């Protein structure tokens, strides 16, 4: 059948490629709300043109002001979108942790959740798990989306490693003393995926792959020892599982977001041509080498936080948000991001508890955030 | 849960790594008869006494006689210990198209057939196809198991292309001059895996990857247009499938027939630790290149022949037998393996037909290797 599909954040990276796959897609797609910030008008009103669809919500007051019309503005303009709207799925490419409320909603709705936005999941963590069927959550995450395809490959008994793959960002091979001279240009510039600033910024500082260490832990059950990274700097292969009986099972095409988001729509079913298959007619190298862990603590960090559970994985989060944002505004030097992140943590043992409610999640981030803010200003 | 196996050819490579993985797995696995051709009498004693079966074929009458207590001795005895043993697999390591009628007889019994000897299936074609019940065959050949694997991610009509990875031989990049000078010693020496010499010279020629890519299309019943092949030097990924919507899933490890082997005897459930993963805490890399088919024209010789059809393929296969004999017995140079088959192939236009019984494809095989005979003697 037709899907509706409600998109979170359509006017960024994420969004205007999913946009694309549903314009190509007519018989397969159909976009019934639109959700955005309020930053980027001229898109947004060409996307209100060009699909038909008024059911918009803009985050931004002002910027909803300035358009006019709009059924959903506010903070929470996005999660009542989602409430109100009759869906199929639910694509959430919101950035960052105020996402978690526009997952919980579409989670109740019943609606698939197609989640590029790895952050609510980080944060909510059990909380999130709790709210959703087996199968509701579909990764859009490219290594997700991956490890999902992979794990096809066997039963769950037979796992015996998820291997997930890092681009190594644009500083891999630097070391720890280059770091410090690192600009927000610099940083702003990935070596294999065109992205958003977030997930560009993450990237670089390898609190990407940490988000994602805990992303895959928490979609497919799998230990935290039982996760591994490895560096592979094309991005072609986008992630592997390793069987039992010595088997490896890898996901591999040249990077464009279009086929995992193309999945996570129309899940299980596969769209003919999302994307570009690799050309095996051309030489081509694949190539790995370990994460330099002394250099880039940040995965380390990740796990540590995931292994102690809770709401230590929102601290996380959080503070990577308030250092990363910090670094942005010229507050911090680089290192100092997965710094900052690391002294939050060390000193966060009482978020060490399942949260029962999302004002316990909330409340773990606000405390991350203030405690973050302090190690910026001092 | 004890499964019962035949193991024919079990003095050979197939054969005693079937037998290490049988000897590690005594609660999953039996061996309940054993078959070989005599050559090799100190391996088959061994084997007796560590299995304990005295159910075992001896082709050669004398060899039989030599080491006593054989039930079966003759060049019908593998198929006559196939006709007269319960069992739940039998494993078809044999070399050469003289497996075809163990290979029908197993078929007959209605046992599992793990399939090693792929000259079998190849100058069977719809004659062996025929006589298998849906999933009753079961790939050994490493390329083959790891499409099985792969074709787990997805639907039948999301399949684009099977891709089978090729070592290129030790004369990987060598002219059509520089494969003159071949000597059988060079031909026997292969860079990544250890093999009969059968399976190793034909690997040098290309051979058998054209028997590969006709394997693929009989087992898997996918079209010789979507079956293709890259070189790969390290043997690491042993096949790949691409789907529809871009993504490629492939199958990797360190190469060791083990794996296959494992996988083929306890389909589909995998057995735990049978092979070595691969290792990411060192670098590597893992590199693609196209064959050059000016110099190495097996395979697209092979799509030929399997695209004719009929008894085409046993052709093909028989030309090979009777013209890699001739090079080894220092009779012809090397490249004039596959200019012989290459002779035969074209001139066979009264064997595109398909096989009623096995004695079509008996008379089609007789046919080309007095072909081929007469290329050699001429
Ligand atoms: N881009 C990629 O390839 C990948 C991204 N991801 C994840 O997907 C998610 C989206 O990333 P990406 O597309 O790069 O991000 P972008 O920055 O490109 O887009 C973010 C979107 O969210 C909107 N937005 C921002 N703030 C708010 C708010 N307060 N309320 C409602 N909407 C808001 C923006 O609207 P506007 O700008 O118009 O205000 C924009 O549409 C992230 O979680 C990221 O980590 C994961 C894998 C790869
Ligand atoms: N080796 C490998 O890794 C791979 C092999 N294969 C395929 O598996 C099959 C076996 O290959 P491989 O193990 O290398 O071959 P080998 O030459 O190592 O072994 C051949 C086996 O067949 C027996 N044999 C030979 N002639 C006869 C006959 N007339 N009657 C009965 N038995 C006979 C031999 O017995 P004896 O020597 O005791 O007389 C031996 O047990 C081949 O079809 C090959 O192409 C496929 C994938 C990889
Ligand atoms: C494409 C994707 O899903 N990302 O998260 C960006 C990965 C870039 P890196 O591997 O973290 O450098
Ligand atoms: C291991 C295996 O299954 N083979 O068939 C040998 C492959 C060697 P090549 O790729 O044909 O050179
Ligand atoms: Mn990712
Ligand atoms: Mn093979």
Known sequence: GRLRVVVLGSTGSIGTQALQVIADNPDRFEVVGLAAGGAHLDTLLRQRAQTGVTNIAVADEHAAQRVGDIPYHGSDAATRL???????????????????????????????????????????????????????????????????????????????????????????????????????????????????PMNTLNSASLVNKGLEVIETHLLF????????????????????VTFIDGSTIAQASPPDMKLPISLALGWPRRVSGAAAACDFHTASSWEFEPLDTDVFPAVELARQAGVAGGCMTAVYNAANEEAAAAFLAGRIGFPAIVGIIADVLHAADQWAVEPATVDDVLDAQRWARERAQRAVSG
């Open 82 to 196: 989602v409430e109100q709207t009759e869906a199929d799925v639910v694509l959430n490419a919101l950035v960052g942790a105020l996402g978690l409320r526009p997952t919980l909603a579409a989670l109740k709705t019943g609606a698939r959740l197609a989640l590029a936005n790895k952050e609510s999941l980080v944060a909510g963590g059990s909380l999130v798990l709790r709210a959703a069927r087996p199968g509701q959550i579909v990764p859009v995450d490219s290594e997700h989306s991956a490890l999902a395809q992979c794990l096809r490959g066997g039963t769950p008994d037979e796992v015996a490693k998820l291997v997930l793959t890092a681009s190594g960002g644009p500083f891999r091979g630097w070391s720890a003393a280059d770091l410090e001279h690192v600009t927000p240009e610099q940083a702003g510039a990935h070596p294999t995926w065109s992205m958003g």
């Open 221 to 240: 059950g799998i230990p935290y020892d039982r996760i591994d990274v490895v560096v592979h700097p094309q991005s072609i292969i986008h992630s592997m």
